[PDB]
Design an enzyme around this catalytic site. Sequence first.
Site, short mmCIF file in Angstrom:
data_model
loop_
_atom_site.label_atom_id
_atom_site.label_comp_id
_atom_site.label_asym_id
_atom_site.label_seq_id
_atom_site.Cartn_x
_atom_site.Cartn_y
_atom_site.Cartn_z
N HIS A 52 53.05 29.89 50.31
CA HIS A 52 53.44 31.02 49.50
C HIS A 52 54.07 32.21 50.27
O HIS A 52 54.50 33.43 49.80
CB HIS A 52 52.39 31.47 48.62
CG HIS A 52 51.04 32.28 48.94
ND1 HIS A 52 51.36 33.61 49.57
CD2 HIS A 52 49.97 31.80 48.90
CE1 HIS A 52 50.19 33.78 49.83
NE2 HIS A 52 49.29 33.10 49.38
N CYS A 93 45.37 36.18 52.77
CA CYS A 93 45.76 34.78 52.85
C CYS A 93 45.98 34.23 54.15
O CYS A 93 46.63 34.87 55.15
CB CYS A 93 47.10 34.78 51.94
SG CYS A 93 46.74 35.57 50.50
N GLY A 104 46.51 40.55 51.91
CA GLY A 104 46.55 40.19 53.14
C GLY A 104 45.49 39.41 54.03
O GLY A 104 45.90 39.02 55.04
#
Lengths: 300, 296
Positions: free
Chosen positions: B41, B136, B134
């Site tokens: 993503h 991820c 942030g």
Amino acid sequence: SGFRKMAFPSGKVEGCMVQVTCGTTTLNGLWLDDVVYCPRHVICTSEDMLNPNYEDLLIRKSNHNFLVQAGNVQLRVIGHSMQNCVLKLKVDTANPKTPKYKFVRIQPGQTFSVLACYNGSPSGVYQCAMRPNFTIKGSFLNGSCGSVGFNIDYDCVSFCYMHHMELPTGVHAGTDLEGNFYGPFVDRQTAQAAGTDTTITVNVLAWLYAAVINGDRWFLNRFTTTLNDFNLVAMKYNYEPLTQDHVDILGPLSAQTGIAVLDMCASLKELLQNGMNGRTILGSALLEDEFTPFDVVRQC
Amino acid sequence: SGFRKMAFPSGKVEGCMVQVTCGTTTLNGLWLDDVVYCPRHVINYEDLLIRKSNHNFLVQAGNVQLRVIGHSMQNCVLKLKVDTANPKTPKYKFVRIQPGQTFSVLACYNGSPSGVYQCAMRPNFTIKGSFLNGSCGSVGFNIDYDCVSFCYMHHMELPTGVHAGTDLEGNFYGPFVDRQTAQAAGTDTTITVNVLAWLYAAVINGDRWFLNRFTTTLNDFNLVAMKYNYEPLTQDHVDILGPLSAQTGIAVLDMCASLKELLQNGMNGRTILGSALLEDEFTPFDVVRQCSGVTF
Ligand SMILES: CO[C@@]1(C(=O)Nc2cncc3ccccc23)CCOc2cc(F)c(Cl)cc21
């Protein structure tokens, strides 16, 4: 979202852990620059544990009596000195993995991460707090002596604790990195007992603010209280007194959530009276006191 | 003495954390050998990826920019080939864990590790983590001897505040997808084998008040477990609890009768290991490891 008991990443401390052997005793040492710090009771025998004269025992030692092992490499001790309850072994190699560091002495209520080690090898990392009675509720087995407590802030490791001993109640006592014990404890096997422990009130309030930030509001109420009335109530549940410093420290969390400290104090008073009634706060059925106001802001 | 929620030492993983920026998105990547793994993503993912060139991905390892020389996608993970092999690459494996298994999470922001915590893959395949925007690309791992087993990579937060992610081969844990759409975690259950392991840890630490003279059949225990939203206890779990049963002298089905009473009657103002709830994020291996001091 989410609230976890979170420790600092232990990497900067792992590169400092060494094994220190003196006679039959093997424990952990902290290798920073060309010095290995460790509990001074590493020079102790069986006859020299109830009433050891550490100055007398250390003077009889030579550098070659201390075997320091960093991984599968033996470090050469070129000097030794004692600073309070910590032994400082000068070595002939500076640790290339030495991070930016400081030695800080903390106050009760402060939190830190512990890197539990056995034979100079890190086995686990956990978070804990300096209890108001100056003990820590750690997870330590025999051989963990010399395991350290630390915080990390802006690439700098602040060493605040070194493990020395386990009290009869299963709680732990230790020193700052300058060898000064936290609490009325001594590194003798003489009868020693931790004082009655109390809840870290300012930390419970910080955790209630964390719960509000995470959407948990069921415990809030329409009441406020005076600081003195709160202290009279909280002291009856073995809670630490809340000072004006604590009220000031909770200011940013009070501003962020819109709940005044004395209003949050009235919600705490009510929780102490009613209990949780089958409900949880941040996945806990007990009031959690090992998150400082600084930890809550950091995590949220 | 003492029982703490303990994570593995994060050092071997810290040396692998990098920052991955693509367009306006900045998240974390795992740098192992000459490949940086991160959630896809960050960029119809085949259609979007084909439009990206190597120079669109900015990879930062500390204050050093790594150059991307290739890119490919494996399920929900993006693999960015870099020109430099990570000299800090530890011995590692990619493993897929089962619900109930625990692992340590190294939470990162902008390729910088900020915290380490221990958690379990819930039976509903979510993790009750602690993540902000942030985070991820933050990874979950176990350490076995000197080998790091990477088992999780963070992808998203569900509306209930719980977290969803994939193994390092990009296969999501649970019925989740990496898209903005209506997604909800299923009703969670308690990891029964882990509660029993935690009761054994309590006994090893001197907490015995919940023990009773009674035992139960595995089937009768499972009938009671179904009623309290507890995962079924299999013969595998009973076998796995064997060493703890031998060490404490409390047969697994004897501890089950204790858990059954705790479920039907409660704690009655008492705590077990400082908890008023039955803790289910310690596996039988975690209990043995902590109540014996295995090092890494
Ligand atoms: C030599 O270390 C001792 C110790 O407490 N060690 C331990 C430290 N941590 C966890 C422990 C878990 C179980 C068993 C011991 C543990 C043993 C007891 O007598 C003493 C007496 C002392 F004045 C000192 Cl400073 C240390 C010690």
